């Protein structure tokens, strides 16, 4: 419905050019930049960011999934959570504290070869 209207409406506040449109990864690379630059001290985007998020996610959706009929590249990115209320720093911190966290476990142990 209003997809093409939100189109420019999102590429806008995202600071990207409508000629690298449906490129979600390159759009994410951007969206994240707008985060590493947001400060509820220089910016009052508390509302102009709440949208910057809502829309982008509505465009990522069309890709982040693996379809029963399995075609299309595979996603595997992370997770940009709906930014509704959670204070920006508690959110922004959370997100990185994750893209930097190690979810592995040490290995079994020694060998047995000869």
């Amino acid at each position: 419905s209003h997809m093409r209207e939100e189109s420019l409406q999102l590429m806008d506040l995202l600071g990207l050019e409508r000629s690298a449109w449906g490129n979600i990864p390159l759009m994410r690379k951007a969206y994240l930049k707008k985060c590493k630059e947001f400060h509820p001290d220089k910016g009052g985007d508390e509302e102009k960011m709440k949208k910057m998020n809502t829309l982008y996610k509505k465009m990522e959706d069309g890709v982040k999934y693996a379809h029963q009929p399995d075609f299309g590249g595979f996603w595997d990115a992370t997770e940009i959570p709906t930014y509704g209320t959670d204070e920006w720093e508690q959110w922004w911190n959370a997100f990185n504290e994750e893209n930097l966290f190690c979810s592995e476990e040490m290995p079994s142990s020694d060998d047995e070869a000869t």
Binding site: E97, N99, L100, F101, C102, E105, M106
Partner: protein
């Protein structure tokens, strides 16, 4: 050559009483250190002889006395050399400051005992390096300060015996220096509230980087052949940790930081490096011990796995410093 035999000879035929010439030095000091250093040797004696026996079988106190006794001759022997090779460079002939400095003697003597002890060592409940320091109540760092100068003040050290001390020195830089309650810290701070203290700590650091880096290199080449531009972005994190977040080394090991620096940097750049392989590779380095990445200090006297150290401490402390690399 400098045969283990040649040394054993010079030691046996050496005096147990300071050289007449080595006394000329005492007598040229603002404050004569004779009785001072002399009373030391004696006091240390019991302390050693005993904290030696109470760690080695029984009935063999003779060997004890012998080792220290011999240790002592080497001790004086060096000092003189160490003093002559100081009159020359830096002309002066006095030397009060140094010869009255408890730690000096305390370190020189230690090193000898470590060298004496380690050559008559084929026999011997093991006292390899680490030991001696806890006997003389000597701090790792301080012992380290005398190592370089010591190897150079005795030409009768076997090529092996030398490597033994080089290892020691190398061990103090990778962990011992940074042990809990070690002057290395309390010293570093003070250099951030009044720079230009002396070429020493900044020198130590110099030798450290020389160490760490090369390991960092060894690993970076294997586990990171593609896009090498990272080798230098890790090192930076690393240094930064040493320089600004040094406290993070308290009761930890250089290698421990290197790795975490490896992981965290490859993680903000979205890179194929799994801690799994990092630790896997780490074993191939000519010294590493599984113990280094399996037991890592965390909170109090609680140790867990490098990974835990990472997510609960590393990642959390220099988090901000990393995020500006994404």
């Amino acid at each position: 050559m400098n045969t283990i035999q040649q040394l054993m000879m010079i030691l046996n035929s050496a005096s147990d009483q300071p050289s007449e010439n080595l006394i000329s030095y005492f007598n040229n000091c603002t404050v004569n250190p004779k009785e001072s250093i002399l009373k030391r040797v004696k006091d240390i004696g019991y302390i050693f002889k005993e904290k030696f026996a109470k760690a080695v079988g029984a009935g063999c106190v003779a060997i004890g006395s012998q080792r220290y006794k011999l240790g002592v001759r080497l001790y004086y022997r060096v000092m003189e050399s160490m003093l002559k090779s100081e009159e020359e460079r830096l002309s002066i002939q006095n030397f009060s400051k140094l010869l009255n400095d408890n730690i000096f003697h305390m370190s020189l003597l230690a090193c000898a005992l470590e060298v004496v002890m380690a050559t008559y060592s084929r026999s011997t409940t093991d006292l390899s390096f680490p030991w001696i320091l806890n006997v003389l109540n000597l701090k790792a760092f301080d012992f380290y300060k005398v190592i370089e100068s010591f190897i150079k003040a005795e030409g009768n050290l076997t090529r092996e015996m030398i490597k033994h001390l080089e290892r020691c020195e190398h061990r103090i830089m990778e962990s011992l220096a940074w042990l809990s309650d070690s002057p290395l810290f309390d010293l570093i701070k003070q250099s951030k509230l009044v720079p230009r203290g002396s070429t020493s700590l900044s020198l130590f650091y110099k030798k450290v980087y020389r160490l760490a880096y090369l390991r960092l290199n060894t690993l970076c080449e294997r586990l990171l052949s593609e896009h090498p531009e990272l080798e230098h972005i890790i090192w930076t994190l690393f240094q930064h940790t040493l320089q600004n977040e040094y406290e993070l080394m308290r009761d930890r090991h250089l290698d421990q930081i290197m790795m975490c620096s490896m992981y965290g940097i490859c993680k903000v750049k979205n890179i194929d490096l799994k801690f799994k392989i990092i630790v896997t590779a780490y074993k191939d380095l000519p010294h590493a011990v599984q113990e280094t990445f399996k037991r890592v200090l965390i909170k109090e006297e609680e140790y867990d796995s490098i990974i835990v150290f990472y997510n609960s401490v590393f990642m959390q402390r220099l988090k901000t410093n990393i995020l500006q690399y994404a």
